Amino acid sequence: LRRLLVWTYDPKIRLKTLAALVDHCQGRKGGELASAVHAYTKTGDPYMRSLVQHILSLVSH
Amino acid sequence: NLNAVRETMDVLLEISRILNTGLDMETLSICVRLCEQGINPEALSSVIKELRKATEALK
Amino acid sequence: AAAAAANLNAVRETMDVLLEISRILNTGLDMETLSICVRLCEQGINPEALSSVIKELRKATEALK
Amino acid sequence: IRRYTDQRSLDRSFGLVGQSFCAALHQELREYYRLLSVLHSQL
Amino acid sequence: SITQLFDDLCEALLPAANRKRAKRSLKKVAYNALFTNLFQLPARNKILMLSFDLRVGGLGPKADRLEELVEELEAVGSVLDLLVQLAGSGPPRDYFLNNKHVGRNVPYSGYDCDDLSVFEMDVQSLISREECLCHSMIQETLQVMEA
Amino acid sequence: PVLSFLYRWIYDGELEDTYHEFFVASDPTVKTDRLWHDKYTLRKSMIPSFMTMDQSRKVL
Amino acid sequence: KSPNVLLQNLCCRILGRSEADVAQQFQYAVRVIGSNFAPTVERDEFLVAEKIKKELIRQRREADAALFSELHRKLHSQGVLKNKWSILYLLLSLSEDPRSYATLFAQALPRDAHST
Amino acid sequence: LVHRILPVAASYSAVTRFIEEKSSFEYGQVNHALAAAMRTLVKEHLILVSQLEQLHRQGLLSLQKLWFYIQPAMRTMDILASLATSVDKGECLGGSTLSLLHDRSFSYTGDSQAQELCLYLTKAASAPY
Amino acid sequence: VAALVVDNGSGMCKAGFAGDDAPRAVFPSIVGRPKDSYVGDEAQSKRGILTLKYPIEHGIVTNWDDMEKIWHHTFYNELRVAPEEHPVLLTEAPLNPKANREKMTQIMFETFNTPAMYVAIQAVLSLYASGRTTGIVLDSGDGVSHTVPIYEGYALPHAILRLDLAGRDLTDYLMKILTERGYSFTTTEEREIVRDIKEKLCYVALDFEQEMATAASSSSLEKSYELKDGQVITIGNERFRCPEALFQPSFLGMEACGIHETTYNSIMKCDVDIRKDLYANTVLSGGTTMYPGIADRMQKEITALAPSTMKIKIIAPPERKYSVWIGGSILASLSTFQQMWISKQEYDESGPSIVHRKCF
C-alpha cells in the first residue's frame, strides 16, 4: 500500500520529532531537561504540540 | 406566526432526508395537513408505498 | 418435531446453571434479567458496555428512593 | 477550447467571472475525457 | 380541506409527462388501500430504534443529528409515524473531519490506522463507482450495435 | 460571482473587485458629505442583462 | 428479536417503570452501547475463568472457587451457548464481595494488534 | 500525453519541500500550522497513486484513464504549489502570511471546489495567530 | 360495470356515476305532474298547476310509490340512466326506511330491474369521504339528519346527535325568520330570495352574549340587501339570532335542545371505545359541513362538553354538499365493496324486494 508510504507517513513525523528532541536534550538532566522540552512546546504544528505537551506533563511530575 | 410553519417544514424535511424516505417537499407539505385532520399515519403509509409501484407499472 | 423439546430443555438447563454461577458471585440479577443479558450477549455485543450501563441504570433507580 | 482556457487560466487579470466560466468549461470538458477513455478501451 | 388532499397527492405521485383516466385508477388504488386497512410505543421511542441501528453501521454523527434535530419539536407525533413507517423506501467532502494535524488543543492519541483504512475505502469507492459507470456506458451503445 | 457582489452590497456597503467587474463602480476620493451626491456611478457596460437598468439602480 | 428492543426491555426491568417514560434512559443507553459494539478485547476463556476463581479465593470462599469449576463444566457440556465469554465477563464485572493493584496481573490481550 | 500530466508531479514536488522546510522553529507559529494543514493533501495524493498501481497490476488501467483520474489532483496540487512559492518569495514569515491566504481565498470566490481547499488552509493556519 | 348513485340522505338528490368526483344531477327532491311526468326543478317552475307533494319528506320517502316515482324521474329521465345496463346505489335515512326500502328494492328488482345494485347506510357511506373508520355523521342535505355512523362500521355508533332540525331545515326556517327579524319577508315569493340571503349573508353564528351584543348594542347590523329580488333587510342579524335555534329549543323554531348542546349531550351519552375515538378524527358533509361558518361554536361546545376533551377535532370540507354523494361513490366503488351488494338471479332468488329481511 504505496509500498507502505501511506502508513509510515504518520509515524515518520513522531520519530523525526523524538530523535530531534533526544539530540537536543543530550547531556542535560533534572530541571535542565524539563526545561529542554518546554522549548519544543512553542510551535504552531498542533500535532507536534500534542506529543510534547504530553511528554512534558510526564517529565514535569 | 407563519414562518414557524416553514421552518417546521425544514425540520420535517431534513429528518425525512436522513430517515431516507422517498419523499419530496410537495408530499411532505400535504401529509402534515392530513395528520392535522387526525387521519391514521400507518394508513397514509399504506397508500404511499403502493402508489409508487403503480407509478412505475405505467411504463 | 421432537427437536423442539430436546433443544428447549438444553436452554432450561443452561439458564439455571448460569443462575447458579450468578448467585455464587452475589450479583443482583433476577432470573428474567439474566435471560435478557445472555440473549444480548449471544448476538455479539461488547460486555464492558452494558455491564457499565446496568450499574448506571441501577444508580438512577436506587437514587430516586 | 483548451488553448482558450489555458490563456485565461494563465494571467490573473481575467476576473472572478472569467474564472467561474473557465471552471465550468473545465468541468463540462472533463466528461469528454471520460468518453475518450471508454473509446480507448477497444483493442 | 379533506378530499382534495388525496386528489393532488395522487397528482404528485403520478409521473411527469396517458395523463387521463389513470389519475382515477390510482385514486381507486389509494382508496382501496386506505379502507381495506382502516377497518381491521410513542414516536420518540420509535426513532431511537432507528437511531441505534444507524449508529452501529458507521455514520454515528448523522444518528446524533437525527435525535438532536427532533428533540426540538417539544413546542407532531402522527407526522413522525409517517417517516419511520416509510423509512426504508428511498432511492438507492470534509477536511476537518478526522484530521489530527489541525485544530487547537488536540489531545494525545497515537496511531488510529482504522481511520486510515476508512479514508482508503472512501477513495476505493470513488474509483469503483467510476468503473461501474464506465461499464454501464460501454454496454449501452454497443448493445444497440450488436442487437 | 455577480450575485456574490450584489447579495452583499444589498446589506453592507463594501466592494472589492481588482480587475473591474461589478457595475456599481465607486470613484476614488470625494470622501466628504459630497459622497452621497457623487461617489457611486453605474457602469453601463457591465450591468448583467438578466437584470434591468432599474434594478441596477435600486441596488445602487 | 433485535438488539434495540431487547435493550429497551432491559431498561424496563432494572427501572421500576413503563416503556414510554424511560426513553431518556434508553437514549443514554443507545448513546453508550452504540459504537462500543465490536469486540474491544481478544476474547478467550482460560483467563476469564481464572479472573473469577481468584476473586472467590480472595474472599476466603475457597469452596465456591471449586464449585465454579464444575458449574463451568456443566455450562460447557450442553453445546447451546456459543459466546460463553461475554456472559461470564458480564457476571464477573457485576460481582460484589459479601464481606487495588489490578495492573501487575494477567489481562486480556488488546486486539488492536490486528486489522480487518 | 506524458508531458501533459507531469506538471502534477512537479506540483507535488514543490509542496513536499515546503511542508518539510517550513516546519522549523525559525519561521514563527503561523508558518508551521500552514505546513501542518497541507500534510492531509499529500496523504490523499499518495493514497490515490497506490490504488492506481493496484489497478495497473490487474491490467485494467490505461494512460488515457490515468489522464481522467488525475484531474482533481491536477487542480488541488497547483492551488497549493502556487501558494507555497508565494510564501517563499513573499517572505511572509510571520503573521503577514494570513494576508496572502485571505487574498487568495477571496480570489477563488468564484470556484467552490477550489475555494474550500483555500478556506481550509486559512481556517487552519490562522489558529496560532 | 360503472356504478350509479342516488345520495338521497334527505329531501335532496345526487346522481353519482362511474365513481366520478361529483354527482351529475343535484336537483332537490321533487317529482313532476300537477305536463304529465317530469323532474323536480323542471316541473317546479309551472307553480300554478305542476308541483310535487314532497315525494321525499325532510328525511324519508312520503309514500311507497314515491320511490318508484323517483325511479321514473331523473333516475331514468336524466343523464341517460338505465339500471338494466349497469349497477346503481341507493342512500338511506337514519336507521333506514322500511316500506320505501321495500318498494325501491322492488323497483330495482323488476321496474328498473338492475342485474347489480347497492343500498342503504348513506350516513355511514359519508365515511368514505370523512377519511376515518370512526366518526360523526353530520353528513346530509335538506330537512333531516342524525349523526350516528359507526365504531368501525358495524352499525354500532356511540355519538347519537340527531335533532328536530338540519342543515337545510334550519335554512328554510331562517328564510322565514327574516320576517321574524322585522323585515318584509313574510311572502311565499320571498322564500326563494331568502334562501340565498339567509344561507349566504347569515354567516358565522357565535356565542349568545356576543350575538346579543352585536345585534343592537354594537354596530354590526346586517348587510345591504336592498336588491330587487325581494330583499328589504339582510339576515346578518339573523346570523346572531340563529343561536336561538343552535342553543335554545323553541325560540327559533325547533323541538329538541339547541344544536350544539344536543350534539354534546348525545356525544356524552356514549361508550368509551368510540365517540372520543370518533371525535379524534371525525369529519362532516352535506349542509352541516357546507355551513356558513357556524361550526366553530359547535367545536367550542364540543370542547366545553367534556373537560377530558381528548383532543376532539371535527373536519368540514367545502365540497361537502357533493361529498355526501362522493363518499357514497368511494364506499361503493372500492375493489371489495360487496358488504351491501344486491344482484341478479344469483341473489334475486331470495327476492331483492324485501324491506329488511333479505337485503339486510
From Swiss-Prot, chain C:
GO terms for cellular component: centrosome; cytosol; gamma-tubulin ring complex; interphase microtubule organizing center; spindle. GO terms for biological process: gamma-tubulin complex localization; microtubule nucleation by interphase microtubule organizing center; mitotic spindle assembly. Keywords: Acetylation, Cytoplasm, Cytoskeleton. It is found in: Cytoplasm, Cytoskeleton, Microtubule organizing center, Centrosome; Cytoplasm, Cytoskeleton, Spindle. The keyword Acetylation applies. It comes from the Eukaryota. Required for the recruitment and the assembly of the gamma-tubulin ring complex (gTuRC) at the centrosome. The gTuRC regulates the minus-end nucleation of alpha-beta tubulin heterodimers that grow into microtubule protafilaments, a critical step in centrosome duplication and spindle formation. Belongs to the MOZART1 family. Associates with the gamma-tubulin ring complex (gTuRC) consisting of TUBGCP2, TUBGCP3, TUBGCP4, TUBGCP5 and TUBGCP6 and gamma-tubulin TUBG1 or TUBG2; within the complex, interacts with TUBGCP3 and TUBGCP6 to form a luminal bridge with actin that stabilizes the initial structure during complex assembly. Interacts with TUBG1. This is Mitotic-spindle organizing protein 1. It comes from Homo sapiens (Human).
Swiss-Prot record, chain E:
It is found in: Cytoplasm, Cytoskeleton, Microtubule organizing center, Centrosome. It comes from the Eukaryota. Disulfide bonds: none annotated. Component of the gamma-tubulin ring complex (gTuRC) consisting of TUBGCP2, TUBGCP3, TUBGCP4, TUBGCP5 and TUBGCP6 and gamma-tubulin TUBG1 or TUBG2. TUBGCP2, TUBGCP3, TUBGCP4, TUBGCP5 and TUBGCP6 assemble in a 5:5:2:1:1 stoichiometry; each is associated with a gamma-tubulin, thereby arranging 14 gamma-tubulins in a helical manner. Gamma-tubulin at the first position is blocked by TUBGCP3 at the last position, allowing 13 protafilaments to grow into a microtubule. Belongs to the TUBGCP family. Component of the gamma-tubulin ring complex (gTuRC) which mediates microtubule nucleation. The gTuRC regulates the minus-end nucleation of alpha-beta tubulin heterodimers that grow into microtubule protafilaments, a critical step in centrosome duplication and spindle formation. This is Gamma-tubulin complex component 6. It comes from Homo sapiens (Human). The lineage of its organism: Eukaryota, Metazoa, Chordata, Craniata, Vertebrata. The chain holds residues 3 to 184 of 1819 of the full protein.
From Swiss-Prot, chain G:
It is found in: Cytoplasm, Cytoskeleton, Microtubule organizing center, Centrosome. Ubiquitously expressed. The modification Phosphoserine is found at S100. Belongs to the TUBGCP family. Component of the gamma-tubulin ring complex (gTuRC) consisting of TUBGCP2, TUBGCP3, TUBGCP4, TUBGCP5 and TUBGCP6 and gamma-tubulin TUBG1 or TUBG2. TUBGCP2, TUBGCP3, TUBGCP4, TUBGCP5 and TUBGCP6 assemble in a 5:5:2:1:1 stoichiometry; each is associated with a gamma-tubulin, thereby arranging 14 gamma-tubulins in a helical manner. Gamma-tubulin at the first position is blocked by TUBGCP3 at the last position, allowing 13 protafilaments to grow into a microtubule. Component of the gamma-tubulin ring complex (gTuRC) which mediates microtubule nucleation. The gTuRC regulates the minus-end nucleation of alpha-beta tubulin heterodimers that grow into microtubule protafilaments, a critical step in centrosome duplication and spindle formation. This is Gamma-tubulin complex component 3. The lineage of its organism: Eukaryota, Metazoa, Chordata, Craniata, Vertebrata. The gene is TUBGCP3. The chain holds residues 7 to 129 of 907 of the full protein.
From Swiss-Prot, chain H:
Belongs to the TUBGCP family. It is found in: Cytoplasm, Cytoskeleton, Microtubule organizing center, Centrosome. Changing R39C: In CDCBM15; uncertain significance. This is Gamma-tubulin complex component 2. Component of the gamma-tubulin ring complex (gTuRC) which mediates microtubule nucleation. The gTuRC regulates the minus-end nucleation of alpha-beta tubulin heterodimers that grow into microtubule protafilaments, a critical step in centrosome duplication and spindle formation. Plays a role in neuronal migration. Ubiquitously expressed. The chain holds residues 259 to 387 of 902 of the full protein. It is linked to Cortical dysplasia, complex, with other brain malformations 15: An autosomal recessive disorder characterized by global developmental delay, variably impaired intellectual development, speech delay, facial dysmorphism, microcephaly, and varying degrees of cortical malformations including pachygyria, thin corpus callosum and subcortical band heterotopia. Most patients have generalized seizures.
